[PDB]
Write a protein that binds this ligand. Structure first.
Ligand SMILES: Nc1nc2c([nH]c(=O)n2[C@H]2C[C@H](O)[C@@H](COP(=O)(O)O)O2)c(=O)[nH]1
Ligand SMILES: OC[C@H]1O[C@@](CO)(O[C@H]2O[C@H](CO)[C@@H](O)[C@H](O)[C@H]2O)[C@@H](O)[C@@H]1O
Ligand SMILES: [Mn+2]
Ligand code: NA
Length: 129
C-alpha cells in the first residue's frame, strides 16, 4: 500500500481565522477542505516541505512555525503520515496561487466533517487554543 509523508500548514491570522483551500473534484479526498500542503520529497526535510508547499500552493513563505501535530492515518487505499505545522508568521498574502478556492475561516466555525477524516483530532485541538 502507498505510504506518504505529507506536510501541511495551519495558517492563522491575528483574528483567529485560518486560511483554508478546497481540494479538486478529481483528487484524493476530493472536494474536501484542507490545510495547504503536500508530499515531503526525497532529500528535503518536513520543515523545508511545508515552506515549499505553501510557496507553491498559496504564495507565502512561512517562518518561525512549530509542529502542531504529527499523526498517521490509514485511508482505504493509502497510508499517510501528516505533519501539521502551525504557521502564525509569514511573508506574503495567501491566495489561490494554483487556481484553487481559498478563504479565511474562523477557527470556531470549522467543521471537521468538511475536512479529510485524518484532520479530526487536529481541528479539535485547534479549537482548544
Ligand atoms: N494538503 C493537505 N492534504 C491532506 C490534508 N489532510 C489530509 O488527510 N491530507 C491528505 C490528502 C492527500 O492524500 C495528501 C496530500 O497530498 P496532495 O496535497 O499532494 O494531494 O494528504 C490536509 O489538511 N491538507
Ligand atoms: O520544530 C519547530 C520548533 O523549533 C523551534 C525552535 O525550538 O523553532 C525552530 O524551528 C522552526 C521550523 O524550522 C523555525 O521556523 C524556527 O525559526 C526555528 O527557531 C520552535 O520555535 C518550534 O516549536
Ligand atoms: Mn497539496
Ligand atoms: Na502541492
Amino acid at each position: 500500500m502507498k505510504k506518504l509523508q505529507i506536510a501541511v500548514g495551519i495558517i492563522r491570522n491575528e483574528n483567529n481565522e485560518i486560511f483554508i483551500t478546497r481540494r479538486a473534484a478529481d483528487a484524493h479526498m476530493a472536494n474536501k477542505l484542507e490545510f495547504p500542503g503536500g508530499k515531503i520529497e526525497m532529500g528535503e526535510t518536513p520543515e523545508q516541505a511545508v515552506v515549499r508547499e505553501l510557496q507553491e500552493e498559496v504564495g507565502i513563505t512561512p517562518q518561525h512555525f512549530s509542529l502542531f501535530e504529527k499523526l498517521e492515518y490509514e485511508f482505504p487505499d493509502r497510508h499517510i503520515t501528516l505533519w501539521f505545522w502551525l504557521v502564525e508568521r509569514w511573508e506574503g498574502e495567501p491566495w489561490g496561487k494554483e487556481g484553487q478556492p481559498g478563504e479565511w475561516m474562523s477557527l470556531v466555525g470549522l467543521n471537521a466533517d468538511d475536512f479529510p477524516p485524518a484532520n479530526e483530532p487536529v481541528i479539535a485541538k485547534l479549537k482548544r487554543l
